[PDB]
Design a protein around this nucleic acid. Structure first.
Ligand SMILES: [K+]
Ligand SMILES: [Mg+2]
Ligand SMILES: [Mg+2]
Ligand SMILES: [Mg+2]
Ligand SMILES: [Mg+2]
Ligand SMILES: [Mg+2]
Ligand SMILES: [Mg+2]
Ligand SMILES: [Mg+2]
Ligand SMILES: [Mg+2]
Lengths: 49, 51, 223, 132, 339
RNA sequence: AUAUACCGCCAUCUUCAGCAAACCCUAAAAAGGUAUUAAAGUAAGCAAAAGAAUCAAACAUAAAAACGUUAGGUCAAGGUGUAGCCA
């Protein structure tokens, strides 16, 4: 089972006809949906990296 | 006033701890009535008890 | 345990020149790098006249005896700050020496800000950088003026935050707010390269001394 | 300026749900329809009667579950069956919901002469899409 | 009709009439009320009892059935709810203590609490904040015509030598209080107190057009100063001092001038170091006994300080006039409450 | 009766680019805060933008358009505060 099959399954099981596709149901990998968090720029002592 | 509002407070010559509060610790002068806000009746009574 | 930590941090302050920074420079070395050359008399600041040896046909000359004394103190302070693991930020707005000063900070292991200084960088650090940002413990101003011939904003803003400042001050600058002023030439490439070398050798010596001091005292604890 | 179904800006302290945040021009684009029947399809009859039932069914549920509705209800008609899907806050005890479900279903099945079912999804508190 | 009935949120929105041209025109007033406050689900005027909604579903092991309260029982319940309404209404009526400042209707001299915590949980509970002026300034704008801002001057202090002031401006008074209160904690002067109760020496200064003449006083003298100076002195911790303010009574210039003078005074220890001599004190209540209050840190000198036959000091007529026997004003040294 | 108590739903500037919140700076601040070979401004929200619609594509047209201004329009869509009529 792959990402392509997932998108097809969700479209069958949750039919949505909204024109904007960002507003449709999605079961995507957390990396795709969650924005990359910029890592902390300093350590425990507080000295920037 | 401070004395009248509290009925348990008693102006007596033997109650020195109360009397001390109405005398200047540095100069030993009895405060005038406006200073502590006591009424004139109790100020006279305090002055006699301190004396 | 507690004795060892006290030894590491309190022993260095019982010696006048714990890091032997005196050897790094000499009046002769400074004179080779043209550290005694100042701006014309017209450009002179009133608070620089103490440090000026005289006027050689319109060009103020900087007494290299006062420079040597002040430079000794400034390097000594910069070493103890580096020894105690403090953050040191190099600051300059001269674009001829922007790459050299950024390269020095990287060599030392410290920080450089040679670009446009944002208003509020230090007085509004939490908003700009984050809630727990640790500010610099020392700012070294290789140049104390910006490119419009006005004091660098970080001189006043570093005093507001009570951060000590080691700055190179020339005959047209205002040393009043610099904690450790170093009177000297700020324009010549040979003068700036000498100062950059001194601050880099000084900082590296202080960091190395800390490692050795920790190893000796640490070894004693088992031994 | 357009004032229709637009929850206007305040000072960033007004919680709004997903339904409230989107203005009318986002209908069929970002947000769907709360009621789904076949009466507005082309060549279909009884739009007026389905629409009147919706108005009443919404006023009935607000009064029958006063202060317990987290969002607007969703009405779903299939054949003669009516299905009411309501997000309800967890304010009332559990047994009270069983009473109001039995009452509201039987009463609306004998009023419109159709099988009516109530579907309740309980939320701990209103879901806030954004603070405006 | 049942179809022309609107919700409570929409009914109060119109009736209250908060939004509208009236608000910008400065227009007691009606108060919103919650009508579902005391209503219990399942309770009606008719008094029916619904098992599982407004009464126990099972009672003493008996499955309850529908019922209705008698006319007498329902009348009691109706009257009881009417009583509960009165109790809740009374709560709003109550008005409780606050402390006035210099005057009952003014904010000057009013404590507004400590500044807010710092970035790393740095609490300032030991600091107190006092208001020194609240002003409603105006800026003309094309969009709004006259627009109003609240300019607040506050002072902070821990009563132990550390104090500061700031100005906060906002459109809302509550916001201006927060801005000034947290800004002033960033401008903390440390004020030197002689023995913790007074200034080290007389201080005379002019800040812009405001003149201040402070005088060092003995214990028990109390604060005899401008009400603002009394407020600041308590924040600093000064207990005994005299001050006079003349010229302009600008509150900002008085606060800036006060802190300027109090922070540029000279402690006895400093004076001994500058001149190298001992600083000795002579009290009339201790007789001729010499009291040494500060000794030079380094080397004690041996050259006596020059004592001129006639000093060239610049004297203030106000100070001297009293000792010359000139009658004072009727307003001078009146009996006042303890400060 | 009062749109000069309001909700609701709009007009106008307007397809204008701002608005407001939290901060920071000023030899005091009523207010102001930009310079890119950069000189005290910063980082989030709303609007614009983007996206969606006119069933490939673009462009275009629609739609959208904040805070305010005109006590702008509407008590006669409906509702409603206050006052008024109840043979
Ligand atoms: K209106
Ligand atoms: Mg130069
Ligand atoms: Mg009054
Ligand atoms: Mg109008
Ligand atoms: Mg138009
Ligand atoms: Mg498109
Ligand atoms: Mg747009
Ligand atoms: Mg009109
Ligand atoms: Mg009209």
């Amino acid at each position: 089972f792959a990402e392509e099959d997932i998108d097809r399954a969700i479209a069958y099981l949750f039919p949505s006809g909204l024109f904007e596709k960002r507003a449709r149901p999605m079961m995507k990998h957390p990396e795709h949906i969650f924005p990359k968090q910029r890592a902390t720029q300093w350590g425990e002592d507080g000295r920037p990296f | 006033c401070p004395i009248c509002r509290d009925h348990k407070l008693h102006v007596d010559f033997r109650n020195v701890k109360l009397l001390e509060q109405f005398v200047c610790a540095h100069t030993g002068i009895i405060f005038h009535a406006p200073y502590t806000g006591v009424c004139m009746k109790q100020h006279k009574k305090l002055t006699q008890a301190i004396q | 345990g507690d004795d060892f930590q006290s030894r590491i941090l309190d022993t260095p302050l019982q010696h006048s020149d714990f890091f032997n920074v005196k050897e790094l420079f000499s009046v002769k070395s400074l004179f080779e790098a043209r550290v005694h050359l100042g701006h014309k008399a017209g450009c002179r600041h009133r608070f620089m006249e103490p440090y000026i040896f005289g006027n050689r046909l319109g060009q103020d000359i900087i007494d290299l005896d006062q420079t040597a004394l002040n430079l000794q103190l400034a390097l000594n302070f910069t070493a103890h700050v580096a020894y105690r693991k403090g953050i040191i930020l190099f600051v300059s707005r001269n674009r001829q020496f922007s790459h050299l000063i950024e390269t020095t900070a990287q060599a030392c292991g410290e920080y450089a800000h040679t670009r446009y200084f944002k208003g509020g960088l230090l007085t509004n650090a939490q908003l700009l950088f984050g809630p727990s940002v640790r500010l610099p413990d020392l700012i070294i101003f290789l140049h104390t003026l910006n490119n419009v011939f006005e004091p660098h904003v970080a001189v006043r803003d570093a005093a507001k935050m009570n951060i000590p400042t080691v700055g190179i001050v020339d005959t047209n600058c205002n040393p009043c707010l610099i904690t450790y002023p170093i009177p000297g030439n700020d324009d010549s490439p040979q003068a700036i390269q000498l100062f950059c070398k001194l601050f880099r050798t000084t900082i590296n010596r202080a960091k190395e001394k800390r490692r050795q001091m920790e190893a000796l005292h640490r070894l004693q604890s088992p031994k | 300026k357009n004032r229709a179904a637009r929850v206007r800006v305040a000072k960033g302290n007004k919680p709004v749900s997903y339904e409230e945040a989107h203005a009318p021009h986002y209908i069929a684009h970002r947000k769907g329809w709360l009621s789904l029947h076949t009466g507005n399809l082309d060549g279909e009859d009884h739009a007026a009667e389905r629409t009147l039932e919706d108005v009443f069914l919404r006023k009935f549920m607000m009064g029958t579950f006063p202060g317990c509705l987290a969002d607007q209800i969703v009405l779903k008609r299939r054949a003669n069956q009516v299905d009411i899907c309501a997000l309800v806050l967890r304010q009332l005890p559990a047994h009270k919901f069983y009473f109001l479900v039995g009452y509201s279903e039987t009463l609306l099945s004998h009023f419109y002469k159709c099988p009516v079912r109530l579907h309740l999804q309980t939320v701990p508190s209103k879901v806030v899409y954004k603070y405006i | 009709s049942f179809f022309t009935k609107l919700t409570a949120e929409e009914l109060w929105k119109g009736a209250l009439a908060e939004t509208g041209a009236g608000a910008r025109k400065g227009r007691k007033k009606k108060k919103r009320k919650d009508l579902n406050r005391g209503q219990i689900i399942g309770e009606g005027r008719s008094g029916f009892l619904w098992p599982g909604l407004n009464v126990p579903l099972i009672k003493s092991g008996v499955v309850q059935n529908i019922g209705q309260r008698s006319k007498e029982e329902q009348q009691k319940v109706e009257a009881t709810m009417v009583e509960q309404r009165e109790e809740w209404d009374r709560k709003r009526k109550i008005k409780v203590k606050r402390e006035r400042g210099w005057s009952g209707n003014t904010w000057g001299g009013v404590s507004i609490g400590p500044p807010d915590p710092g970035p790393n949980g740095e609490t300032y509970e030991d600091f107190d904040t006092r208001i020194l002026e609240v002003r409603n300034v105006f800026n003309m704008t094309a969009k709004e015509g006259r627009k109003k801002s609240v300019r607040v001057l506050v002072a902070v202090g821990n009563g132990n030598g550390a104090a500061g002031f700031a100005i906060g401006k906002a459109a809302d008074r509550g916001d201006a209080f927060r801005k000034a209160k947290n800004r002033a904690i960033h401008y903390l002067h440390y004020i030197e107190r002689y023995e913790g109760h007074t200034i080290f020496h007389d201080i005379s200064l002019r800040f812009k057009r405001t003149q201040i003449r402070m005088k060092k006083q003995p214990r028990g003298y109390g604060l005899r100063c401008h009400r603002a100076i009394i407020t600041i002195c308590r924040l600093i911790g000064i207990k005994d001092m005299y001050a006079r303010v003349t010229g302009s009574m600008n509150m900002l210039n008085l606060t800036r001038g006060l802190f300027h003078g109090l922070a540029r005074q000279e402690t006895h220890q400093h004076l001994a170091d500058k001149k190298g001599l001992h600083v000795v004190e002579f009290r009339e209540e201790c007789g001729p006994l010499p009291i040494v209050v500060a000794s030079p840190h380094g080397a004690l000198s041996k050259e006596p300080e020059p004592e001129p036959e006639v000093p060239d000091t610049k004297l203030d007529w106000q100070d001297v006039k009293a000792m010359q026997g000139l009658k004072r004003s009727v307003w001078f040294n009146l009996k006042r409450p303890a400060t």
